Scaffold this active site. Structure first.
Site, short mmCIF file in Angstrom:
data_model
loop_
_atom_site.label_atom_id
_atom_site.label_comp_id
_atom_site.label_asym_id
_atom_site.label_seq_id
_atom_site.Cartn_x
_atom_site.Cartn_y
_atom_site.Cartn_z
N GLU A 61 0.81 -1.19 0.00
CA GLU A 61 0.00 0.00 0.00
C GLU A 61 0.85 1.24 0.00
OE1 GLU A 61 -3.44 0.19 2.49
OE2 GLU A 61 -3.45 -1.97 2.68
C1 LIG Z 1 -4.95 -10.07 8.11
C2 LIG Z 1 -3.88 -9.02 7.93
C3 LIG Z 1 -4.03 -8.07 6.92
C4 LIG Z 1 -3.01 -7.17 6.63
N1 LIG Z 1 -3.02 -6.44 5.44
C5 LIG Z 1 -1.93 -5.64 5.12
C6 LIG Z 1 -1.57 -5.35 3.79
O1 LIG Z 1 -2.25 -5.71 2.83
N2 LIG Z 1 -0.50 -4.52 3.53
C7 LIG Z 1 0.23 -4.01 4.58
O2 LIG Z 1 1.28 -3.42 4.34
N3 LIG Z 1 -0.06 -4.35 5.88
C8 LIG Z 1 -1.07 -5.25 6.16
N4 LIG Z 1 -1.01 -6.01 7.32
C9 LIG Z 1 -0.15 -5.56 8.46
C10 LIG Z 1 1.28 -6.07 8.30
O3 LIG Z 1 1.24 -7.42 7.89
C11 LIG Z 1 2.04 -5.94 9.62
O4 LIG Z 1 2.26 -4.58 9.96
C12 LIG Z 1 3.40 -6.64 9.64
O5 LIG Z 1 3.47 -7.74 8.76
C13 LIG Z 1 3.65 -7.13 11.06
O6 LIG Z 1 5.01 -7.39 11.22
P1 LIG Z 1 5.70 -7.13 12.65
O7 LIG Z 1 7.18 -7.45 12.54
O8 LIG Z 1 5.46 -5.73 13.16
O9 LIG Z 1 4.89 -8.13 13.62
P2 LIG Z 1 4.80 -9.73 13.42
O10 LIG Z 1 4.76 -10.12 11.96
O11 LIG Z 1 3.58 -10.20 14.19
O12 LIG Z 1 6.15 -10.30 14.11
C14 LIG Z 1 6.20 -10.72 15.45
C15 LIG Z 1 6.72 -12.15 15.43
O13 LIG Z 1 7.01 -12.60 16.74
C16 LIG Z 1 6.42 -13.85 16.98
N5 LIG Z 1 6.06 -13.93 18.40
C17 LIG Z 1 5.02 -13.31 19.02
N6 LIG Z 1 5.13 -13.51 20.35
C18 LIG Z 1 6.33 -14.10 20.59
C19 LIG Z 1 6.86 -14.76 21.71
N7 LIG Z 1 6.36 -14.54 22.91
N8 LIG Z 1 8.09 -15.37 21.60
C20 LIG Z 1 8.82 -15.26 20.44
N9 LIG Z 1 8.24 -14.72 19.30
C21 LIG Z 1 7.00 -14.15 19.37
C22 LIG Z 1 5.22 -13.93 16.06
O14 LIG Z 1 4.90 -15.26 15.71
C23 LIG Z 1 5.69 -13.11 14.86
O15 LIG Z 1 6.32 -13.92 13.89
C24 LIG Z 1 -1.91 -7.07 7.49
C25 LIG Z 1 -1.79 -7.99 8.54
C26 LIG Z 1 -2.77 -8.96 8.77
C27 LIG Z 1 -2.48 -10.07 9.74
#
Ligand SMILES: Cc1cc2nc3c(=O)[nH]c(=O)nc-3n(C[C@H](O)[C@H](O)[C@H](O)COP(=O)(O)OP(=O)(O)OC[C@H]3O[C@@H](n4cnc5c(N)ncnc54)[C@H](O)[C@@H]3O)c2cc1C
Ligand SMILES: *[C@@H]1O[C@H](CO)[C@@H](O)[C@H](O)[C@H]1NC(C)=O
Length: 467
Positions: A61
């Site tokens: 996006e």
């Molecule tokens: C349904 C959905 C729709 C979306 N649509 C869009 C889209 O189209 N385009 C866009 O840009 N954004 C969208 N997003 C948002 C985007 O995907 C997120 O902002 C981003 O991928 C999240 O990454 P992160 O590193 O911040 O968190 P996460 O990807 O959640 O990373 C955290 C990681 O830590 C792990 N974990 C959690 N707790 C612990 C624990 N206690 N011990 C060790 N590890 C832990 C989890 O399994 C995970 O792998 C969407 C997300 C979802 C789920």
């Protein structure tokens, strides 16, 4: 591999992105503890029917604008992931009456145009607001102000249009969402208005795998990361931090020592009890944690014996203007993406997500058949052979799908969320300065958080001053 040691909690996009910047700075003594059995987090594909579809993020996006969205080059050029620009230009042609068939285009187009200009009005007002958000409001209040009314869009078309305009983007109704921080959206103002739909059987997650392989030892024959520094199925349950250093306990009772911990788990996970902090985090930090929103965004997938829905120009996005706000109104068909797969996508968010997640897949497919049978009273609509109901809210490693900026959270107290406590550093989309909620936001928070720490570890600057 010698020098300070950082443990990174989570191998999602921000977790990987952080550990990369850390490695690059020279901080190579990294331990990534990943709760599930795979990296990539909320970028996750799955087999539906005979195809791979996305449970998490599906879009890039913010493309085609003044500044290059960092996700875009990786997707379009590096990995050349299959993808399609979304075209929402035709929605007026494609809004279904609650009972029987489409509205008058000319009619819908008006309500659309009218919605658009209320939001244009709210854009203008937002720019006038003070930077402390002393005078911020909910998107809805701005709507009331403009529409001269005790309430916002309150009639079936108006709402599904409202929903499309807002809920479909931030996974929560305009009436909880801060105006100042969504209208307009830095993703779109900065990187362009366009969104691109990744449909490539490798997975959107391929982006994370790719960045991971920049710095993590991977098998020369197979390709799998094999780097001992990456630790899957490692559920972090306790973080002990004193000015001496940090202890990380996982659920299989392993205790690791480090100089510093980078925590990338979702705001949802932070809101839960999964990771216990010893000592308890300061009140300020806890308040920031619980006041921000972790929205749910559910992509219900459907398999069909035959098609019964229009294809052709403008037919990808259609809405169902239910009298019950947010009730199977947003629909996607995949003639381009998976032709000829015979699958539909309905999205739901928020209150409906929580209901739907708790209820039997069967029961859900019931409700959806009913709606589809209403929408095409004409055609002869078969039951869906398969349903898919992503349950992210339920999942303890996610507890939601992305953050949302609520009203009453200002810029200061947003910053408190990302502000480190001691040797405990936070990264993740919810810590992104201007792109909370987004893959690119999560990616860029990786780098920023990493840099905050690198500044402490190397340059010996460790007092972070919240603004
Ligand atoms: C349904 C959905 C729709 C979306 N649509 C869009 C889209 O189209 N385009 C866009 O840009 N954004 C969208 N997003 C948002 C985007 O995907 C997120 O902002 C981003 O991928 C999240 O990454 P992160 O590193 O911040 O968190 P996460 O990807 O959640 O990373 C955290 C990681 O830590 C792990 N974990 C959690 N707790 C612990 C624990 N206690 N011990 C060790 N590890 C832990 C989890 O399994 C995970 O792998 C969407 C997300 C979802 C789920
Ligand atoms: C992405 O790649 C395509 C085909 O490889 C190229 O022609 C096009 O310029 C790129 N699209 C965008 C939006 O940059």
């Amino acid at each position: 591999t010698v020098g300070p040691r950082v443990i990174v909690v989570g191998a999602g996009m921000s977790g990987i992105s952080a550990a990369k910047r850390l490695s690059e700075a020279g901080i190579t003594d990294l331990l990534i503890l990943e709760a599930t059995d795979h990296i990539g987090g909320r970028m996750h594909k799955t087999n539906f029917a005979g195809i791979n579809v996305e449970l998490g993020a599906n879009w890039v996006e913010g493309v085609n604008g003044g500044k290059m969205n960092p996700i875009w080059p990786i997707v379009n050029s590096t990995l050349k992931l299959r993808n399609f620009r979304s075209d929402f230009d035709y929605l007026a042609q494609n809004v279904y009456k609650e009972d029987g068939g489409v509205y008058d285009e000319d009619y819908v187009q008006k309500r659309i145009e009218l919605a658009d200009s209320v939001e244009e009005m709210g854009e203008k007002l937002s720019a006038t607001l003070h930077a402390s958000g002393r005078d911020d409001m909910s998107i809805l209040a701005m709507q009331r102000l403009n529409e001269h009314q005790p309430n916002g869009p309150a009639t079936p078309v108006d709402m599904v249009v409202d929903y499309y305009k807002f809920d479909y983007e931030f996974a929560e109704p305009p009436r909880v969402t801060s105006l100042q921080n969504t209208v307009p959206l830095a993703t779109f103002s900065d990187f362009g208005d366009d969104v691109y739909f990744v449909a490539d059987q490798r997975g959107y997650e391929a982006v994370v795998y790719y960045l991971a392989g920049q710095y993590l030892k991977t098998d020369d024959k197979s390709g799998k990361i094999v780097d001992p520094r990456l630790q899957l199925n490692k559920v972090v349950r306790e973080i002990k931090y004193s000015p001496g250093g940090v202890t990380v306990k996982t659920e299989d009772n392993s205790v690791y020592s480090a100089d510093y911990v980078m925590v990338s788990a979702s705001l949802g996970v932070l809101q839960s009890d999964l990771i216990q902090f010893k000592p308890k985090l300061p009140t300020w930090k806890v308040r920031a944690i619980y006041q921000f929103d972790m929205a749910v965004y559910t992509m219900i997938f459907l398999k069909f014996p035959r098609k019964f829905w229009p294809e052709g120009k403008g037919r990808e996005f259609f809405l169902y203007a239910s009298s019950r706000r947010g009730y199977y109104g947003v629909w996607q068909e995949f003639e381009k993406q998976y032709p000829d797969a015979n699958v539909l996508l309905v999205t739901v968010t928020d209150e409906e997500s929580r209901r739907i997640e708790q209820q039997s897949d069967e029961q859900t497919k019931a409700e959806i058949m009913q709606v589809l049978r209403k929408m095409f009273p004409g055609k002869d609509v078969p039951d869906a052979t398969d349903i898919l109901v992503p349950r992210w809210w339920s999942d303890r490693f996610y507890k939601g799908t992305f953050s949302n900026w609520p009203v009453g959270v200002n810029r200061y107290e947003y910053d408190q969320l990302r502000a480190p406590v001691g040797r405990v550093y936070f990264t993740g989309e919810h810590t992104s300065e201007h792109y909370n909620g987004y893959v690119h936001g999560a990616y860029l928070s990786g780098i920023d958080s990493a840099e905050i720490l690198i500044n402490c570890a190397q340059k010996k600057m460790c007092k972070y001053h919240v603004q």
